[PDB]
Amino acid sequence: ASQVRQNYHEDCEASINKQINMELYASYVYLSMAYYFERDDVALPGFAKFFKESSDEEREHAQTFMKYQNKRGGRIVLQQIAAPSMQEWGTGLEALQAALDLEKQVNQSLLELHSTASGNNDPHLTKLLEDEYLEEQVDSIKKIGDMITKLKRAGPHHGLGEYMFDKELN
Amino acid sequence: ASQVRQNYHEDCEASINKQINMELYASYVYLSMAYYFERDDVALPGFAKFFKESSDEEREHAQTFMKYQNKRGGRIVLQQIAAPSMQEWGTGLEALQAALDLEKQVNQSLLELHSTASGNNDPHLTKLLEDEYLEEQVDSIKKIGDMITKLKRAGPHHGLGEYMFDKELN
Amino acid sequence: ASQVRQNYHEDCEASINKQINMELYASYVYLSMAYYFERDDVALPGFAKFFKESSDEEREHAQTFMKYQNKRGGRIVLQQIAAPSMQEWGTGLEALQAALDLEKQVNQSLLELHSTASGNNDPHLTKLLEDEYLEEQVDSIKKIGDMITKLKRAGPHHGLGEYMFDKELN
Amino acid sequence: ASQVRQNYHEDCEASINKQINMELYASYVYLSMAYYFERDDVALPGFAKFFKESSDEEREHAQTFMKYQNKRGGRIVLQQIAAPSMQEWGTGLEALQAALDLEKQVNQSLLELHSTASGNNDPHLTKLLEDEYLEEQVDSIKKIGDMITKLKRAGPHHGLGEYMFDKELN
Ligand SMILES: [Fe+3]
Ligand SMILES: [Fe+3]
Ligand SMILES: [Fe+3]
Ligand SMILES: [Fe+3]
């Protein structure tokens, strides 16, 4: 095994590799949304900037797991990054609802990884998940929930409320 | 012929004079729109500013073509500048739709000039068109398309949406 | 079609989408290399930094193609990003040789795109390829070729020469 | 008991005292290494500086545990600090291999402390271990592992490679 490996279970190593792929997939989804909202027949630049930033954040989360794998003496295994199943994202609200679902999907998998780390008595990994992932994930979910509520107030259908809400994201 | 002339076809010289007139005409159209939107019974200061700037840009494009004609040793021939097609431009959306049509008419004419320069093996002129005209033309068309989409979302009829959209242009 | 689409052939639209996928794949390959060179049993921080930067460059090339598709009125269709061919890249020289072959594969694909654009008389797209892709591609291939020659001089096998060469990349 | 003591198990108090002694011992080992590498017949100033800093870090880790014992209402009991196992540490690689083994011994002891704290439901102490000890310990082990790999590449025997590697630590 690696000269550095200590108290690092194979199940945690394997789960971290799966989580890297999920972070990269979420990155890919947000990239798709970011460019969709720059279509000339969509033209929502506030939503575009919001999802560009979200895509960068997910990519950095993925890289932090890659750095972590190396720190612990595990071996990174990268797999194909699936395209989003559905790339016509609809209105701003429909994309925000899709982002909320994805954030909770990622959160569920991070909590499952935490429960693998806990069961294997790996406090270095539970600390990583708590400090570097679970905190930002709860904040991200609350932010998107807020946004969905504000947009439902402004008016979620194609119309003036959506035009106005988009400006607050710029 | 001019002491500087080299590889400059008379068809390209003639087409440059045509484009100078077209740019000056587009300048004139946007000037008409600019002051239409400063009428007391129209009063759309963002649209007025957008079209004032558009009118200056077209004028500078025409002067760059005049400078180019002299650079290559062609002879500038100025013609009458036609009156704008309209004296009243309608709503903001109707003016943007006329501007989109006009921008696409100019683009077609520039692409036709590129074809003439290419058929006459004039790479100095194809470089001029690609770098100084065709690039800005696609960006301008994309911007106006975005604007039309944004205005249709806010509410394209005379109303609060048009009043609010106008502020983003100011 | 899009309100902005003009002189944009369906074959160039489709080839742009393929190239977006290829640029994202190359980004993924360099990301794999970057973190491989941070393994505790590899520990080549100069190579790691070099491929991290290359990975960012390829992602930005992909995003520029996505912006371009929207500028022309095309539709971005994202496809799955294949996993890198290798998880272990070998010596520094072997990774550089793999990078050179990939850079030449991408360059061949860009040149085929240019030929498609030229045959369809699309000078806006030929200008894009020449200015934003083909120029950097030749410079990248020349830089990697230089690096391979330098590393062959320093000593390309695992040893003091590779250790010293790695420092010039840091 | 102390007026401040709350949820502080006698077994964790005793284990803190043992760990203070272990951190002081590791500080002593690195101090021995530091001045060994300043012998006129060794003369490795980069290795000397590296272990001087490691010796200071371990003393600060011990002092933080002493502060902690007082914070919780425990009683510091200091024990004799054993002399280092070796007075002569050999080559740079041999000292690094001894440092890696010591870092992993300390890490194992910290993980056992964490398990004691967890079994006694002491989250203030598990947080201390995770944030102030286990994180730096993994980073130190990864850094030393990197150094061993780099030195094996440069050439770990007495020779030009060791001379060059020593410079990267200075
Ligand atoms: Fe994430
Ligand atoms: Fe113009
Ligand atoms: Fe590229
Ligand atoms: Fe310590």
For residue C142, the tally of other CB atoms under 10 A from its CB is 11
3-state helix, strand, coil in chain B (%, to 5): 75, 0, 25
- Judge whether D68 and D76 are in contact, CB under 8 Å: no
Q: How was this structure determined?
A: X-ray
Whole-number Cα distances in Å, B116 to B9, B19, C116: 9, 13, 20
Could you tell me which of D27, D161, D167 has the C-alpha nearest to residue D93? Answer: D161
List CB contacts (< 8 A) between B165 and chain A.
Answer: 163
In order of A26, B23, B104, B110, C64, the CA distances from C122 in angstroms are 35, 22, 15, 12, 18
Return the residue matching tokens 């998107």: A144
Of residues B108, B135, B142, nearest to C4 (C-beta): B142
Tokens 């000269």 correspond to: A3
| Residue A134: count of CB within 10 angstroms of its CB | 17
Tell me the angle at which helices A160-168 and A92-119 cross, rounded to the nearest 10 degrees.
50
Residues of C in contact with A73 (CB under 8 A): 40
Q: Rounded distance, CA A70 to CA D31, Å?
A: 29
Q: Is residue A157 less than 8 Å (CB to CB) from chain B? A: no
Say if CB C145 and CB C100 are below 8 A apart: yes
Contact between chain D and chain C (3 or more Cβ pairs less than 8 Å apart): yes
| CA A120 to chain centroid | 25
Instruction: Please answer whether residues D42 and D48 qualify as being in contact, where contact means their C-beta atoms are separated by less than 8 angstroms.
Output: no
**Helix intervals (H) in chain A:** 10-36, 45-72, 92-119, 123-129, 135-154, 160-168
Q: Which domains does chain C have, with CATH numbers?
A: 1-170 (1.20.1260.10)
With tokens 């016509």, the residue in question is A88
Q: Assign C81 to helix, strand or coil.
A: strand
Question: Was A10 annotated as part of a binding site?
Answer: no
The total of other beta-carbon atoms located within 10 Å of residue A74's CB is: 23
3-state secondary structure of A126: helix
Give the tokens for residue C27.
């980004």
Of C3, A162, A37, A154, residue with least CA distance to B155: A162
Q: What is the 3-state secondary structure (H, E, C) of B61-121?
A: HHHHHHHHHHHHCCCCCCCCCCCCCCCCCCCHHHHHHHHHHHHHHHHHHHHHHHHHHHHCC
List the resolution, Å: 2.0
Q: How far apart are alpha carbons A45 and A31 in whole angstroms? A: 14
Sort out which chain C residues have CB atoms less than 8 A from B131's CB and list them: 127
Contact B150 A163 (CB under 8 A): yes
Taking the Cβ of residue C160 and every Cβ of chain D, the question of whether any pair is shorter than 8 Å is answered with yes
- Check the annotation: does A131 bind a ligand: yes
Q: Which one of A3, A41, A80 has the shortest CB-CB distance to C40?
A: A3
Tokens of B11: 């068809």
